[PDB]
Amino acid sequence: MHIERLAVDESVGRAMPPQRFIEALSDLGVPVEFAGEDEQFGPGDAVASFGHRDAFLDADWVHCIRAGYDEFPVGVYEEAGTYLTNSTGIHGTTVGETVAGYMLTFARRLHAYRDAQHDHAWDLPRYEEPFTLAGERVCVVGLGTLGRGVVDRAAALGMEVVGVRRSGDPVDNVSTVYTPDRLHEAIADARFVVLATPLTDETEGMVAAPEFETMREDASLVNVARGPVVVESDLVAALDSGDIAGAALDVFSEEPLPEDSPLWDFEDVLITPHVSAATSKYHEDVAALIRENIEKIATGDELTNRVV
Amino acid sequence: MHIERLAVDESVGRAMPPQRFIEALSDLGVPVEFAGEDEQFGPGDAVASFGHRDAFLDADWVHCIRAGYDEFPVGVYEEAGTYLTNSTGIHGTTVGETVAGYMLTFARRLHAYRDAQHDHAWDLPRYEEPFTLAGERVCVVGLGTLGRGVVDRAAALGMEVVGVRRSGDPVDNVSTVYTPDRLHEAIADARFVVLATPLTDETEGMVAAPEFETMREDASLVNVARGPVVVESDLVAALDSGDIAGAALDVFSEEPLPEDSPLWDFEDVLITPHVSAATSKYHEDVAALIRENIEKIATGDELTNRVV
Numbered sequence: 001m002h003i004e005r006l007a008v009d010e011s012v013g014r015a016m017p018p019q020r021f022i023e024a025l026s027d028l029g030v031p032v033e034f035a036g037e038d039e040q041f042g043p044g045d046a047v048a049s050f051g052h053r054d055a056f057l058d059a060d061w062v063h064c065i066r067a068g069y070d071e072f073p074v075g076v077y078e079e080a081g082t083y084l085t086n087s088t089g090i091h092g093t094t095v096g097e098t099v100a101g102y103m104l105t106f107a108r109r110l111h112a113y114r115d116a117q118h119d120h121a122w123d124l125p126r127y128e129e130p131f132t133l134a135g136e137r138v139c140v141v142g143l144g145t146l147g148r149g150v151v152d153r154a155a156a157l158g159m160e161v162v163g164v165r166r167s168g169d170p171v172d173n174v175s176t177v178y179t180p181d182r183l184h185e186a187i188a189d190a191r192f193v194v195l196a197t198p199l200t201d202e203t204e205g206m207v208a209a210p211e212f213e214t215m216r217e218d219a220s221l222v223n224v225a226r227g228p229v230v231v232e233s234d235l236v237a238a239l240d241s242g243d244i245a246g247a248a249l250d251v252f253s254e255e256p257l258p259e260d261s262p263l264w265d266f267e268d269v270l271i272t273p274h275v276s277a278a279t280s281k282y283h284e285d286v287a288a289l290i291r292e293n294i295e296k297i298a299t300g301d302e303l304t305n306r307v308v
Numbered sequence: 309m310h311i312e313r314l315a316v317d318e319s320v321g322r323a324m325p326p327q328r329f330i331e332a333l334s335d336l337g338v339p340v341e342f343a344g345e346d347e348q349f350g351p352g353d354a355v356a357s358f359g360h361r362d363a364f365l366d367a368d369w370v371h372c373i374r375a376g377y378d379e380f381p382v383g384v385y386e387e388a389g390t391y392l393t394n395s396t397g398i399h400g401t402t403v404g405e406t407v408a409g410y411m412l413t414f415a416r417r418l419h420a421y422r423d424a425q426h427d428h429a430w431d432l433p434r435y436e437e438p439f440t441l442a443g444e445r446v447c448v449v450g451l452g453t454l455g456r457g458v459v460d461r462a463a464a465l466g467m468e469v470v471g472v473r474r475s476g477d478p479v480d481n482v483s484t485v486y487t488p489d490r491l492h493e494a495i496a497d498a499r500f501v502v503l504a505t506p507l508t509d510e511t512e513g514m515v516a517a518p519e520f521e522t523m524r525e526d527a528s529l530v531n532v533a534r535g536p537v538v539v540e541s542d543l544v545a546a547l548d549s550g551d552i553a554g555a556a557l558d559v560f561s562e563e564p565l566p567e568d569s570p571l572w573d574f575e576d577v578l579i580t581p582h583v584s585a586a587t588s589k590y591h592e593d594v595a596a597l598i599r600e601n602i603e604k605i606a607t608g609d610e611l612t613n614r615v616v
């Protein structure tokens with residue numbers, strides 16, 4: 001399979017300016033070209049894209065610039081003979097730092113202080129409100145690149161770390177790992193529950209009213225995975241009733257989050273606009289994977305992060 | 309010395325409910341009692357207090373429940389034969405976590421997102437705005453309990469750490485230690501400059517217009533020390549002119565921060581109301597110091613954290 005061109009789909013703009021990425025891929029050994037949204041593809045084309053387009057099935061290879069490839073019809077790629085790769089492996093530091101930032105925000109009450117800053121108010125916390133992450137329990141659901149980025153930072157901060165993954169097998173810096181049919185055992189005693197799984201048939205709606213019942217009333221949910229891993233209306237109901245204390249949410253069942261969502265209005269909810277993995281160097285981070293896979297395809301080696 | 313009672317001055321309420329601290333010391337080996345602000349003291353009395361009262365000079369021992377004793381008349385304690393101890397040693401985790409929180413808030417843009425949350429606005433950052441702490445440089449000025457709490461967390465997050473202390477001697481997790489006469493060299497290339505010194509003769513007004521000139525235009529100041537280590541009007545001017553990018557400020561020249569201060573209104577300033585060390589377990593953390601010095605008094609050993 002003989003790549004002659006890398007097309008950079010305009011949808012990459014949802015993560016990074018296309019020209020920054022195109023410039024990062026100079027010296028690839030094939031030309032790199034911008035592709036607008038209604039262009040055609042053919043043999044010899046590789047495409048780098050955020051979203052899926054059916055026109056891509058005329059190309060030889062699509063590199064999805066996201067870790068999560070849930071919006072791509074994987075079955076149709078195989079039939080068309082188009083390779084599909086993803087960008088898992090590059091988001092550990094960005095998302096790990098954002099999640100550490102969410103947990104420290106809640107522990108040290110930074111968000112409440114920011115609210116007060118708008119009012120020029122010197123509002124002192126109640127004695128019980130500020131706490132330390134050190135000594136507190138976090139459950140990380142999904143123990144891959146994202147989850148491990150969270151775990152390693154949580155462990156370094158002195159948290160007790162448990163988690164969940166498909167295999168249930170051990171992970172460094174996780175004291176106890178559970179399979180997904182022991183999720184309720186994993187989350188029950190945690191001060192924070194972090195979601196870092198792909199969106200699949202299995203994970204869709206994982207976290208719903210039963211899970212919020214099981215969680216501690218003083219616990220917070222962190223979702224940096226995909227919105228539909230949570231049943232969003234159940235999350236709203238749990239927040240309304242005080243079944244849990246709050247949440248840090250980067251992803252939602254409808255994005256952008258509608259202006260009329262109830263989720264904006266809770267003091268102890270942090271909303272971030274699907275930017276937990278944002279970075280001014282995303283173009284370099286993704287370019288490294290493209291260079292790697294170009295070499296693999298050129299030499300007949302197995303592609304890195306091949307989905308189908 | 310021979311202690312028969314610990315009085316808990318009501319001013320401890322500026323950090324912790326007095327009854328919580330009294331009850332935490334129910335097995336100390338001497339009785340512990342609430343003291344109101346106009347009580348008198350005598351031989352055998354120890355007193356725990358946030359601030360100084362002249363009535364305490366009739367006691368044998370005052371434990372200041374703060375690390376910083378700059379509002380105590382140290383001179384006069386020696387004359388009265390009253391021992392004075394402070395609470396340095398107990399704020400590393402709380403302040404370390406807060407400062408990691410500030411830094412992660414700036415890197416990951418969480419404060420901007422909080423502001424947008426109030427407006428129900430899905431506001432995407434500029435491409436260049438989000439970055440990672442990993443790989444960025446922090447200079448920690450003061451390498452004691454606070455400063456080491458910052459250092460260790462910064463280092464674990466992948467930062468390059470340099471710092472400043474009086475002795476110049478190496479410190480674990482600091483790549484390069486400078487003496488205070490090389491402050492300008494220490495700060496010049498740092499993305500974050502963190503202040504963690506006591507307020508002394510030498511430290512007052514350390515950070516003023518010339519230091520803001522020296523610092524990078526993209527850098528942020530963190531002050532968790534004392535407000536007067538900074539020349540506050542010079543900080544405002546520096547922020548206005550874009551000499552530095554922003555600041556996380558827990559302490560100020562005048563506290564509470566006056567409502568007319570320009571500091572409240574900068575997007576890239578975080579105001580917190582002298583709470584970087586706040587904790588729902590402060591009672592336990594201070595109690596541990598009392599228990600340690602009661603053992604020292606009983607055995608005739610030197611007191612821990614003795615100021616005079």
Ligand SMILES: NC(=O)c1ccc[n+]([C@@H]2O[C@H](COP(=O)([O-])OP(=O)(O)OC[C@H]3O[C@@H](n4cnc5c(N)ncnc54)[C@H](OP(=O)(O)O)[C@@H]3O)[C@@H](O)[C@H]2O)c1
Binds near residue numbers: 068146
């Ligand atoms: N918010 C953002 O900007 C952002 C950025 C990047 C990624 N994401 C999302 O995060 C997802 C994960 O990315 P990643 O790079 O960390 O993926 P990854 O490295 O493939 O890790 C996935 C992890 O999920 C586990 N898992 C799968 N099904 C599970 C289940 N039912 N319950 C519990 N754990 C389960 C896997 O278990 P095993 O270890 O046993 O295989 C693995 O530990 C992506 O698919 C994407 O949706 C979000």
Ligand SMILES: NC(=O)c1ccc[n+]([C@@H]2O[C@H](COP(=O)([O-])OP(=O)(O)OC[C@H]3O[C@@H](n4cnc5c(N)ncnc54)[C@H](OP(=O)(O)O)[C@@H]3O)[C@@H](O)[C@H]2O)c1
Binds near residue numbers: 455475
């Ligand atoms: N915001 C808050 O709520 C909060 C909480 C606790 C403390 N504080 C403030 O923080 C201060 C430090 O507390 P701590 O427990 O960390 O004290 P500490 O353990 O005694 O450490 C003080 C450090 O400052 C260094 N130092 C002294 N003069 C300096 C100078 N001119 N330039 C640079 N470094 C200098 C000392 O250097 P050497 O090691 O070489 O002697 C030491 O490393 C307290 O005095 C208090 O004012 C604030």
Ligand SMILES: [Cl-]
Binds near residue numbers: 228232233
């Ligand atoms: Cl949903």
Ligand SMILES: [Cl-]
Binds near residue numbers: 328
């Ligand atoms: Cl109480």
Ligand SMILES: [Cl-]
Binds near residue numbers: 540
């Ligand atoms: Cl000043």
Ligand SMILES: [K+]
Binds near residue numbers: 059081082
């Ligand atoms: K094809």
Ligand SMILES: [K+]
Binds near residue numbers: 088089144145
């Ligand atoms: K991975």
Ligand SMILES: [K+]
Binds near residue numbers: 176
């Ligand atoms: K383990």
Ligand SMILES: [K+]
Binds near residue numbers: 215243
């Ligand atoms: K619950």
Ligand SMILES: [K+]
Binds near residue numbers: 214216217
């Ligand atoms: K429960």
Ligand SMILES: [K+]
Binds near residue numbers: 334
């Ligand atoms: K007790």
Ligand SMILES: [K+]
Binds near residue numbers: 366368
């Ligand atoms: K005395």
Ligand SMILES: [K+]
Binds near residue numbers: 396397452453
């Ligand atoms: K100390």
Ligand SMILES: [K+]
Binds near residue numbers: 479480481482483
């Ligand atoms: K060192």
Ligand SMILES: [K+]
Binds near residue numbers: 512
């Ligand atoms: K000066």
Ligand SMILES: [K+]
Binds near residue numbers: 520523524525551
């Ligand atoms: K400057």
